[PDB]
Every structure is written in C-alpha cells, then in structure tokens.
Amino acid sequence: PQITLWKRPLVTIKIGGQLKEALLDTGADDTVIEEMSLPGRWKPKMIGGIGGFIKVRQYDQIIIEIAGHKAIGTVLVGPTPVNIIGRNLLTQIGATLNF
Amino acid sequence: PQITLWKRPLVTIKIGGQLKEALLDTGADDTVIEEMSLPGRWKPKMIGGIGGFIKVRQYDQIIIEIAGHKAIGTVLVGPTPVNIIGRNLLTQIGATLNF
Numbered sequence: 001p002q003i004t005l006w007k008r009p010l011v012t013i014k015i016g017g018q019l020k021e022a023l024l025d026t027g028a029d030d031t032v033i034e035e036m037s038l039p040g041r042w043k044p045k046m047i048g049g050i051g052g053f054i055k056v057r058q059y060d061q062i063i064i065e066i067a068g069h070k071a072i073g074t075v076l077v078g079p080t081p082v083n084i085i086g087r088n089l090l091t092q093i094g095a096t097l098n099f
Numbered sequence: 100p101q102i103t104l105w106k107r108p109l110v111t112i113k114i115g116g117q118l119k120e121a122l123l124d125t126g127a128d129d130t131v132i133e134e135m136s137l138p139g140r141w142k143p144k145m146i147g148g149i150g151g152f153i154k155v156r157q158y159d160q161i162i163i164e165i166a167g168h169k170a171i172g173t174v175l176v177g178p179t180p181v182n183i184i185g186r187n188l189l190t191q192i193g194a195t196l197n198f
C-alpha cells in the first residue's frame with residue numbers, strides 16, 4: 001500500500017491471536033504495545049519518549065502480523081498512549097518513506 | 100527520494116533562519132522543534148507521548164524547508180528531546196509510507 005498522512009496511519013495488527021490497532025511510526029526505533037500477555041522471558045529496557053523515560057518489558061522473537069504482513073521480532077510492553085510499530089518491524093514489512 | 104528505515108529518517112530542515120536536523124515522523128500528529136525563538140503570536144499547549152506530557156508554544160503559519168521542500172503550518176516549540184516533523188507538514192511535501 002501507499003499510505004498518505006492526512007489521518008493517523010493506523011493499521012490492524014495480530015499478536016497472541018488477538019487483533020489490535022497500532023500506529024505506523026517512523027519516529028520510533030522500537031515497537032511498543034500496551035499491557036498484554038506474551039510468552040517467554042522478558043528483559044528490562046528503558047526508553048525515552050517525548051515526556052521522559054519509562055520502563056518496559058522487552059520480549060524478543062514475537063510473532064506479529066502488521067497490516068497483513070508477517071513479522072517476528074522484538075516487542076516492548078509498557079504504558080504508551082497508543083500501540084506503535086517502530087522501525088524494527090517496519091523494516092521487516094519492507095516499509096519506506098517516499099516523497 | 101525513497102528513504103530507508105534501517106536508520107532514523109533524519110533530514111535537514113530550515114526554520115526561522117536556522118538549519119536543524121529533524122526526524123520524519125509518521126507517528127507525530129504535529130511538528131515539534133527544540134527551544135528556539137520564532138516570530139509572531141503563540142499560545143501554550145500540552146502534548147503527550149511516551150513518558151507523559153510536555154508544555155510547548157504553538158506558533159501558527161510558520162514556513163519550514165524540509166529536505167529542500169517548502170511547507171507552511173503550525174510548529175510547536177518546547178523541550179522535546181528530538182526535532183520532529185509531524186504529519187501536519189509531511190502531508191504538504193507529499194510524503195507517503197509504502198510497503
């Protein structure tokens with residue numbers, strides 16, 4: 001697809017068998033999802049957004065579908081105003097910015 | 100251009116007579132620039148992201164040159180850790196996300 005930016009670039013994701021809405025976010029290095037259950041072990045991570053630093057749970061090698069494209073990679077779980085798909089998974093689905 | 104997302108999508112901008120580096124950020128509704136003076140009227144605003152909210156100054160009808168492309172719109176000025184070109188100006192340069 002070619003997504004213009006007049007509205008938020010929201011897509012459906014599937015993680016853990018559940019559909020969720022998430023924002024395609026080229027300004028995010030990392031993918032950050034609201035509190036949910038994921039399998040396996042997690043590791044700690046501190047991330048700095050516009051308002052300051054927060055602790056999140058880092059889950060590696062998580063299966064996630066993004067707008068119908070399959071990805072397997074790192075998901076951070078923690079308090080975010082919206083689910084954001086960052087460059088670690090945007091690269092897996094082949095996304096680029098174009099103008 | 101076609102910009103890869105293997106790295107942060109940073110470009111040079113010109114704003115208020117100043118050259119700056121900024122992130123092309125599809126996850127940002129608005130454009131947010133680190134503290135600087137701009138001419139004209141402003142009003143206070145609060146904007147929120149990971150880590151919470153910051154207070155910014157909202158300047159309307161500001162021209163910015165983005166990777167050589169002129170656009171006009173609202174610019175928010177405040178203690179952001181990174182300069183962000185948000186959707187309000189990305190639309191004006193015809194930016195799309197493609198996959």
Ligand SMILES: COc1ccc(S(=O)(=O)N(CC(C)C)C[C@@H](O)[C@H](Cc2ccccc2)NC(=O)O[C@@H]2C[C@@H]3OCCO[C@@H]3C2)cc1
Nearest residue numbers: 027028029030047048049050126127128129146147148149
């Ligand atoms: C109303 O307009 C705005 C504009 C921008 C924001 S934002 O900067 O908070 N942001 C909105 C998102 C969270 C819905 C844009 C987003 O692209 C920021 C943009 C950004 C980038 C870097 C620092 C601050 C903000 N990225 C971000 O938070 O990324 C997180 C993942 C990882 O990325 C590298 C930095 O560390 C983390 C944070 C909020 C409101």
Ligand SMILES: [Cl-]
Nearest residue numbers: 073074088089
């Ligand atoms: Cl990853």
Ligand SMILES: [Cl-]
Nearest residue numbers: 171172173187
């Ligand atoms: Cl605007």
Ligand SMILES: [Cl-]
Nearest residue numbers: 004005190193
């Ligand atoms: Cl258009």
Ligand code: NA
Nearest residue numbers: 139140159160
């Ligand atoms: Na103005």
